[PDB]
Amino acid sequence: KTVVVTTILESPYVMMKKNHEMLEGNERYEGYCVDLAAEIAKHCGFKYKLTIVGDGKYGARDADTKIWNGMVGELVYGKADIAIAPLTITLVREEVIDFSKPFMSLGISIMIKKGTPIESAEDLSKQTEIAYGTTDSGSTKEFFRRSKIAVFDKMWTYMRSAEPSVFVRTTAEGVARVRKSKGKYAYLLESTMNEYIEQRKPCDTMKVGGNLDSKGYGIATPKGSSLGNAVNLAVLKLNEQGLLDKLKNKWWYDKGEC
Template sequence: QDLKLKEGSQVSQQGVAMINGKLYEGFCIEVAEKIKERYERLEGKGPGSFNYKFKLVDDNNFGSANKTVGTWNGMIGELLDQKADLALASLTITRARQRVVDFTKPFMKIGISIMIKKPDKQKPGVFSFMEPLDSMVWVCVSLAFTGVSLVLFFIGRWSPFEWRAEASRKEISVTNAFTLSNTLWFSLGALMQQGSDIFPRSISGRIVGSAWWFFTLILISSYTANLAAFLTIERLIPPIQGVEDLVKSKDVEYGTFKGGSTEAFFEMSQVPIYRQMYEYMKSKGDQVMVNSDKEGYEKVRQSKGDYAYLVESPKNDYQNQKKPCNTMKVGENLDHKGYGIATPPYSPLRKDLNLVVLMLREEGELHKLQRKWWFDKGECGTMDSKDTSKSPLTLSNVSGIFHILIGGLVLSMMVSLVEYSVHRLRKQHKLRFRKQMDAPRPAIKIEKKNPLEVLKAAGYTGICDNTVSYTFKPPEQLTTFESGKNTEL
């Protein structure tokens, strides 16, 4: 039996097929070919068991219900009228459609997204040199600069090794190089990678200097690397960043495909912001709503950035890869759902098609086809070459060097305390030694004697030269002189 597949003209047409005398190619056509191959491999099937031909849907609709008479149009209506055996297109699985037809497992995951026109690229501004670092990082660097300067100043006052004696005009004065202004100059010189003419002499001061030098080395290197991106890449700044911005914006209108699953999503949603969006689109009517996706794409391209089209994410991604390459997707998807193959109710094909879709997903064939038709054949370059986004370094990116700096400051203060304590102990020891040296001692008399007289007194009659000898007596035998009196100790 020949199967008739309904292919909506809005779909990105992707394999190659002749339909009504016209050549079509696209993703869904290749998916149909893969389905045929896998279907004929199933148990009990064989070559020729799955033959099909494409037919475009007559009214160019996916399928929406007429609540007044209870009928459906588009592909869903033709399935119900037995005009087709299955519908293979970007047909979203919804609760309303699932009630009247059967769907296979989703062959593609999707979500509602926002399409806007690309804004004009902006050149770097006057203060672009500050953008490589987040504002909080600049604040923390300023605090670190002040903190290091103060710690170094107090260490210079506290540590005895930072004081030095200088003589000028016969006066000796004790000076300290690390005044408050000098410590600020030292920290600024290190931050600017220029150095200064003063350096710490104490171990604690050198620890502060080393921690600050390491901090500035990593910070300046990271800043320089990020600065190149901010000064060379022209920025795209869209007027909105997501659905919240879209709702709040008074300059950007938004709409969607009239009667499609996207409109039904907003109509049925209980989320306040989505209900607000539906009421807005309903009040604007044809001013923002379109009768086809193609009309929506053109409305975005012809706008000046003041219209956003709400469309399913695969269509958004596909159109962003088509010339003139002036559309883009912003924000996250608003919901999560999928495209499925629809069959008439209780169709015997549904069970086998489910197995085939699962086989294609597990083998990665669907992902390969999506990559091929969305990006490899794109006219605006790959996703990687398009991605020119850049972001400043946040505090979480450089928090490590702040931790090292804080650790260095704490260590330096501990070492400074040890230096001060050791210096005090040494000073006390010197004072005790000096007191001992300055204590009063007994006088020592040096007695000059003529050896000849000594020998004669002893009865020596020999010859002796007239030399002088000095005899040191112990303290108890010394002679003291007091008021002209001679006293023997």
């Protein structure tokens, strides 16, 4: 009956509302994905319940245990019926779950503390004073791990061996490390969120260079789910109507602090 939506607490997609403690259910959260979830449900005609993924991860398969974690995992093991989050459409994930066409287009990028002498990935690879890393269990980390491109492979070879760890558990943790490391730490994260942070006080971070790749986020459902077809048509319908662009402007730029 009520569709269980797995999502992640990640600003500006899903965030705890100001006085959420005084509210119930879906009304406790606000964000791009909360707005989208409400629309996807309206158009597909289903009641739903927003839920925050238990392990706070996007989703990766543990080689060896072979168990999927994050939102991907909740879909795979049947804990949730659908995932509405900034979840990247990738091959290893599409092999175990279904994705609608993209609702947002983006790519990996470099976030620096303003003033950092770095202008590209090539710059990062060619040096060592400035450490750099990615978010722990997801598509960005897999991108470098699986890359055959010289620059990206050089970066992986360093990152995978760097001590202490250059990987962070969450985006907030990477942004903080960037802000606190006095230009000695750069962060590899998707452009959508790099751009978001660039507009939030203290306005001390910046996105540099072009995107490392081009890809998208999709609404995910368990393989062979009944919701798949309709959510995909809903996504296409809503993008064509301009809602998705309207929502990015709302959560990114209208609410800009810089």
